[PDB]
Amino acid sequence: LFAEPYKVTSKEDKLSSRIQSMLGNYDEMKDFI
Amino acid sequence: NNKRWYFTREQLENSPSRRFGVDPDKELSYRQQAANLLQDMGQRLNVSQLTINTAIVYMHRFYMIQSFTQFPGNSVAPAALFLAAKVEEQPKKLEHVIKVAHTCLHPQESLPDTRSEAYLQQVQDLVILESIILQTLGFELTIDHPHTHVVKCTQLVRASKDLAQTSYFMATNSLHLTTFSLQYTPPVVACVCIHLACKWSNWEIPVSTDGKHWWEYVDATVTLELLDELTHEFLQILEKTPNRLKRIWN
Amino acid sequence: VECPFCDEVSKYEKLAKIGQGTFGEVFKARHRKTGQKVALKKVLMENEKEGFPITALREIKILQLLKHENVVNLIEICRTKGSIYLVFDFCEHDLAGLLSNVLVKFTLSEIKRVMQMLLNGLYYIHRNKILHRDMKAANVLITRDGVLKLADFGLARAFSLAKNSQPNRYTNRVVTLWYRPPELLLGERDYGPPIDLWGAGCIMAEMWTRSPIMQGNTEQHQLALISQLCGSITPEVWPNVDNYELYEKLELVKGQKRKVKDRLKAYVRDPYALDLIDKLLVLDPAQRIDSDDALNHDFFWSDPMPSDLKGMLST
Ligand SMILES: Nc1ncnc2c1ncn2[C@@H]1O[C@H](COP(=O)(O)O)[C@@H](O)[C@H]1O
């Protein structure tokens, strides 16, 4: 029913950019979540 | 009744604590500390996240009626957790909680005598406060959390542990650092947490094979504006928090 | 001290103590402004050891969940200025009191209606993953208008079917002795809805016998009375009953045949009635009829059809 989520191209978004700063880098903090 | 424990920004601004001259940001801070304390105690008492979550919601709701002036967050949190533990069928002995509360609030002093006066007094102060919480909440103890909806959804859209665990993580964070539990229904908050985890993690959920966006399988009111609007509000609330070592740490 | 969502019980006027209770426990009352008849149940706090009774929190959580025509209705929760009361919609009668009253007469058609409401009520609670765990005539209420209601959820808990790898370990010593199913007397902790329906069977028989059919004095005497009525407890009729630690450690009569129908025949007579009872009082909980099947059993769909109770309750 649902295709599998896919890694989007590096976001040029203003939201994705802001989030990367408000929470830190995902690939770095990922292993702690 | 349905819209009883949900408030507008006006109602949140005009809180009981505001009535006694507490900065909006200072009240937000008080809540964040109570949650942090609830989370700490919870992990020590060894209760599930669900138990903590509930206690946190009890707390958020408690302070839409009572003031931080009249009720310290450090007195209420233990009582709230004590109550939540019973409600969620993970009851912890009254002694156990008061001790653990001391371990968190006073890592210094010797665990007071269990036969002394100042202690027996704490046992009553907590039991009393539990009773006040119950009355303040109108004995409405059954809480619905975003986590339930987050899981059911990430299951549906075949998310990786990577993404699923991050969404779940964001859910817990929303209870800690924001008052979304007082503003938006759990299903909506779940969508915000997923949408956020996706942006952060760079995953994108396709449209289903029935031409319906993933959030439509969680809540029929959610739109992409709302997801952007609430994600914005979320990030905004985070920006205002003092040390964001609170996010990634506990 | 603001408290908008918990009203003072003063709003009701107390009229009487109901059921020769224990103390100032349950009162019949009326709203001072609307005249609404209610029943106030004071939350007992003799066991003040561990704060507000967790066992009471349980009851309230469940009462607030269960909203159905044949389940007692929790209106609200009131305080004093401390004590706490659970406020219910008043119910004039209770099945125990009715069957104790010699002047009360139940027609076959009316007994059908009673059992039908009772079973429809059980279907609802089990559907919402709840176990009553204290079935008995005393806990079956009926209103003046003839609507049956299940009551006393102070013993009830929620139940899950998960996780298919580890069984649930619930409180074993539950349900009044006289209404307790065999599986519980044998020491079962992984049980479910079937325990409530065994109770329903005991109650259905009471509708005719007018008294609890199996009044034991000890857990094992109860098991003995069950054997005398339902037949001996053997793996042949209850597969994998050997696994109960107590199956061997309990002196169990070995020769007993099944006498359920033969014994109640004198009281009941109607074949369909005897049959449904025979299916409710089944030793093997896995082979015991459930709520849904019971409600579609011929008993409820053969003459005389079930009828309302209003008329029969004025006497
Ligand atoms: N409407 C009522 N009238 C009289 N007694 C009631 C009523 N509802 C509940 N009770 C009694 O209150 C106790 C708790 O009932 P429950 O709320 O079902 O746990 C039991 O002893 C019931 O028989």
Residue numbers in the entry:
A (entry chain G): 34 to 66
B (entry chain B): 8 to 257
C (entry chain A): 8 to 88, 97 to 330
What did the original publication write about this model?
Here, we report the structural and functional analysis of P-TEFb in complex with the cognate binding site on the SEC scaffold protein, AFF4. In all three independent copies of the complex in the crystals, AFF4 residues Leu34-Ile66 are ordered, binding to the second cyclin domain of CycT1 opposite CDK9. Consistent with the coupling of folding to binding, AFF4 lacks intramolecular tertiary contacts as it snakes across the CycT1 surface. An extended segment in AFF4 tracks antiparallel to the H3′-H4′ loop in CycT1, and two short AFF4 helices fit into shallow grooves in CycT1 between H3′ and H5′ and the surface formed by H2′ and H3′. A pocket between CycT1 Leu163-Val164-Arg165, Trp221, and Tyr224, for example, anchors AFF4 Phe35, which forms a classic edge-to-face interaction with the Tyr. To accommodate AFF4, helix H5′ straightens and residues 251–256 form a helical segment that packs against CycT1 helices H1 and H2' and forms part of the AFF4 binding surface. Superposition of the CycT1 subunits of the structures of Tat-P-TEFb and AFF4-P-TEFb shows that Tat is positioned to pack against helix 2 of AFF4.
Promoter escape requires positive transcription elongation factor b (P-TEFb), a heterodimeric protein kinase composed of CDK9 and cyclin T1 (CycT1) subunits. P-TEFb triggers promoter escape by directly or indirectly stimulating phosphorylation of the RNA polymerase II C-terminal domain and the associated factors, NELF (negative elongation factor) and DSIF (DRB sensitivity inducing factor). Recent studies of gene fusions in myeloid leukemias, as well as complexes recruited to the HIV promoter by the HIV Tat protein, uncovered a family of Super Elongation Complexes (SECs) that bring together active P-TEFb and other transcription elongation factors.
